[PDB]
Design a protein around this ligand. Structure first.
Ligand SMILES: CC(=O)Nc1cnccc1C
Ligand SMILES: CC(=O)Nc1cnccc1C
Lengths: 265, 264
C-alpha cells in the first residue's frame, strides 16, 4: 500500500483469500470490514500515528468508532484483487470521519463504499469529550481541506437515525460470546465481531436467497471479553430491510443498534 | 505465490495484518493455520485440482483432515513478511500428507513448520476409504518421489498417540457455538475454528506469560453449524496440556489434542 501523490489519502490492494469467502465464493461483509480496518491502520502508520496523536497519548485519549456504514454493489470473488482507497476528515469538535472507496482492480469500477464516525474518549474513565484545538491541528495536515465524501448525496442512508427495536423481536440468536480470535492486540473485542453478531439473527433463508447491500451500525458500549450478547432482528419492510439490536444477555443493556438492506439474488 | 522450478512444491509470501495479531503484536496460531490453509488451496489450484481429482468428483469422494501438527519458533510481527513453502506426499492406502515450512522473508530463517494427515471420505455417507490406484496415479505426478519431510527426526512429536482426557477436567470453556464467519464456502466449520476452541480452555494467565510452541490436533468428527461444543483441558507437566472437544449434550468426542508452551 501507499499514500497517494498529494499525501492526503491511502491506497492498498488485497487478493481475496479462500477462508475469506462465503457460500457464493465471494468475500463476506466481515472480510470487507476487516480490510477497511487494515487499510485504515496502514494509512495511520504511513503518516506517523499509533490513531493517537502526541497530545492524545499524554492525556490518555483514544479514537473510538461511534458508527460504521457500508454499501456493497459487488462482493469480490475468491482470488480477485480489490483496491481500497481511504482518507480522513475533521468534523469540527464532534469528532473525525474515515471514508473508503472499494474498486475492482481489473475494471477500475467502484464496487463498494464506506463511511465511519469516530469520537474522542478517555481510555480509562470512558468519558466522551469534544475535539480540542491542540489535537485538531496535529491531524488536519493529513486530511483534504475541501470536503471529500464517500456518500455525498443530500439525504443519504449513512446519516439516518436508527430506532430502538421493541420486544418481542421477530428473530434472535442468544448467548453469543467472544473467543480470543475476536479480540484485537489490546484485548478489546474487534469492531467487526459486532457486525457478525448482528448478522447471526438474520434467518439462513434470507442469507441463502438475498445479498446484503447496506449495513449501518451504531456502537453504544463495548462488549467485554467475559460478557454474553443477545442478537435481535425484526423485519421492517423486492428488497428486505431489518432493524437490529445487540444487548447484554443478563441486564439487557444496549451495546449496538443497526439496520440492514438486502436485495434478491 | 508460485510453484517452484521443479513444480513439486509451492511458495507464497504474506504480510502480517493488524487484525491478525494477538496482545504480543505477533500473528496468532489461528492466523498461522489460516495462512497454511490458504497456501494449500493456492497449490491445489496451480496444478488443476478443486483437492478433489477427476475420479473423486465422480465417486463423491473428498480429502478430510485427520491430524494437524504445528511447531512455531518465532511468530511473525505485525507488518512482517512471512514466506510459506508447501508440498504433498502419498502415504500409500492410508491417505495423503501435506507439509509446510515457514520462513522470515528478510533473514531466510525457518520460524515454523507444520504437517497434516488427510484421509479419503465419501462426502454423503461420511465413510472412510482407502485411496486406490486410480486416484493415486492422478496426483502422484504433483508430489516429490523421494520422501521430503517437515518433521524428519525419528520419534518426533507429529506422530505421537494422544490419549482421551478423563473427567473431571482441570479447566473448561462450555457452550462454544460457531457463527457464519467460522464456516467455509461449503458451509462446513473451518478446521482452524477447532484450534481456537481447544485454546479457549487454556487459562488467560498461561497465555499472558507463555508462548505456544507446539500443537497437535486429531479430528475425529465434524461440528455441525447448529452444534454446541465444550472445550476441556488438563495440565500434564515448559507447560504441557491434554485437550478434548466434545458436543455439549451427549458428550460425543469431536477432537483431542496436546499443546506445549514455553515461558516468555
Ligand atoms: C484523526 C485522524 O483522522 N487521523 C488520521 C489517521 N491516519 C491517517 C490520517 C489521519 C488524519
Ligand atoms: C491429494 C493431493 O495431495 N493433492 C494435491 C493438491 N494440491 C497440490 C498437489 C497435490 C498432490
Amino acid at each position: 500500500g501507499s499514500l497517494t501523490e498529494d499525501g492526503l489519502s491511502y491506497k492498498e490492494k488485497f487478493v481475496v483469500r479462500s477462508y475469506e469467502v462465503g457460500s457464493n465464493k465471494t468475500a463476506t461483509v466481515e472480510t470487507i470490514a476487516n480490510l477497511l480496518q487494515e487499510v485504515g491502520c496502514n494509512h495511520a502508520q504511513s503518516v506517523g500515528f499509533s490513531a493517537t496523536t502526541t497530545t492524545m497519548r499524554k492525556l490518555h485519549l483514544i479514537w473510538v468508532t461511534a458508527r460504521m456504514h457500508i454499501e456493497i454493489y459487488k462482493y469480490p470473488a475468491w482470488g480477485d484483487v480489490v483496491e481500497i482507497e481511504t482518507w480522513c476528515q475533521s468534523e469540527g469538535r464532534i469528532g473525525t470521519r474515515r471514508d473508503w472507496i472499494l474498486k475492482d482492480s481489473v475494471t477500475g469500477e467502484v464496487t463498494g463504499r464506506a463511511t465511519s464516525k469516530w469520537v474522542m474518549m478517555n481510555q480509562d474513565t470512558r468519558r466522551l469529550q469534544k475535539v480540542s484545538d491542540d489535537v485538531r491541528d496535529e491531524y488536519l495536515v493529513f486530511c483534504p481541506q475541501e470536503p471529500r465524501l464517500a456518500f455525498p448525496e443530500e439525504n443519504n442512508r449513512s446519516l439516518k437515525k436508527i430506532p430502538k427495536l421493541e420486544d418481542p423481536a421477530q428473530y434472535s440468536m442468544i448467548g453469543l460470546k467472544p473467543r480470543r480470535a475476536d479480540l484485537d492486540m489490546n484485548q478489546h473485542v474487534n469492531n467487526v465481531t459486532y457486525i457478525g453478531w448482528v448478522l447471526e439473527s438474520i434467518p439462513q433463508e434470507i442469507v441463502d436467497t438475498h445479498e446484503l447491500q447496506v449495513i449501518t451500525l451504531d456502537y453504544r458500549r463495548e462488549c467485554q471479553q467475559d460478557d454474553v450478547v443477545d442478537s435481535l432482528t425484526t423485519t421492517t419492510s423486492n428488497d428486505s430491510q431489518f432493524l437490529h439490536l445487540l444487548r447484554l444477555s443478563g441486564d439487557g443493556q444496549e451495546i449496538n443498534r443497526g439496520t440492514t438492506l438486502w436485495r434478491k439474488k
